[PDB]
Amino acid sequence: KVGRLIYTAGGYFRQSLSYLEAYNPSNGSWLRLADLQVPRSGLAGCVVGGLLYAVGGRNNSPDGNTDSSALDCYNPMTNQWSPCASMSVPRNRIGVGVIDGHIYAVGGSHGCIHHSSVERYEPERDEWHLVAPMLTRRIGVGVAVLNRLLYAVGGFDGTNRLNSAECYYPERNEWRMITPMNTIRSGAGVCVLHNCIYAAGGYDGQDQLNSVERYDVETETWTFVAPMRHHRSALGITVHQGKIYVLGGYDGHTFLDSVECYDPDSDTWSEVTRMTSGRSGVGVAVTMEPC
Numbered sequence: 001k002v003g004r005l006i007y008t009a010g011g012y013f014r015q016s017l018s019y020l021e022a023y024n025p026s027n028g029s030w031l032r033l034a035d036l037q038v039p040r041s042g043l044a045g046c047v048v049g050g051l052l053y054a055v056g057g058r059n060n061s062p063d064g065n066t067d068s069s070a071l072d073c074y075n076p077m078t079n080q081w082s083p084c085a086s087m088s089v090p091r092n093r094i095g096v097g098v099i100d101g102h103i104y105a106v107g108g109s110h111g112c113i114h115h116s117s118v119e120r121y122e123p124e125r126d127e128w129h130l131v132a133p134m135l136t137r138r139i140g141v142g143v144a145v146l147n148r149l150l151y152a153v154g155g156f157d158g159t160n161r162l163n164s165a166e167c168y169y170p171e172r173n174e175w176r177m178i179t180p181m182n183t184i185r186s187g188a189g190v191c192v193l194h195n196c197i198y199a200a201g202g203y204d205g206q207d208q209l210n211s212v213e214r215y216d217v218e219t220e221t222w223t224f225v226a227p228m229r230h231h232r233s234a235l236g237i238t239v240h241q242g243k244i245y246v247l248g249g250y251d252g253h254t255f256l257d258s259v260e261c262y263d264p265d266s267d268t269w270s271e272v273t274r275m276t277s278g279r280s281g282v283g284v285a286v287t288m289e290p291c
């Protein structure tokens, strides 16, 4: 369990960013690591086999906006990024989840297209293949995996921001709606802790949110927990040693540098550190410290 860091890749502040930085909860330190080859915001991060993957996003620059179909892998042992096979389609504001060593890329946008499509990456073959599409088009979708089922939560379908959510059952290659959230949320942070799917923050179409709700997969209910200290949309999120960490985002005024940590035992959020600069739209995941 020891020696794992929270990695934050990419993001947005004025333009899309190439930063890869890693935070050590055990000593409070931050490390700046190898930049992404292409700056991206609206990407997702995940880890398989100790390698960190950056999936999708968009490169916003003064010279334009390019939605990304890229999959790039970072090896902490070498501090190097390598390109992997690209997805079938660019996906900005994507959601990803990992089941049994396979990466699922969910939704996202390509220009004015809002995807319902979903595709699955096999690291051992370096190949993507499409799977069944969601029942709803969703960008800014939160994705998490619990008990080898994949959940897609909230987002924006091109017309309305969503409180709906759905679950993918891999052995039937089928999506089914689940109970909708109590709040409309696009760009929320979605993760799994214990037997629940948490949805933190986001934008309800009117304001950035500090509220947080969790879906108990057994009872099929959404319940609010303690709100974050800060309203945040387009936040990064991950879980580490039994606590949720939320990183950055936009509060309606500032791009936040604050990182908050949720303790489910006390139902409290605490501010634990600050990123090196404020940003939104980052990809976040946990793996071993680099060499």
Ligand SMILES: O=C(O)C[C@H](c1ccc2c(c1)OCO2)c1ccc2ccc(OCC(=O)N[C@H]3C=CCCC3)cc2c1
Binding pocket: 011, 012, 041, 042, 043, 093, 139, 140, 141, 155, 156, 161, 186, 187, 188, 202, 203, 233, 234, 250, 280, 281, 282
């Ligand atoms: O609901 C919508 O229509 C789209 C929705 C959104 C959310 C909150 C908003 C909002 C728009 O408008 C002001 O608050 C969204 C959802 C997830 C994202 C993930 C990543 C991402 O990456 C780039 C990025 O961070 N851009 C930011 C620039 C300035 C502030 C907004 C975002 C942008 C995302 C945007």
Ligand SMILES: [Cl-]
Binding pocket: 041, 042, 058, 092
């Ligand atoms: Cl964007």
Ligand SMILES: [Cl-]
Binding pocket: 045, 046, 047, 048, 098, 285, 286
């Ligand atoms: Cl992961």
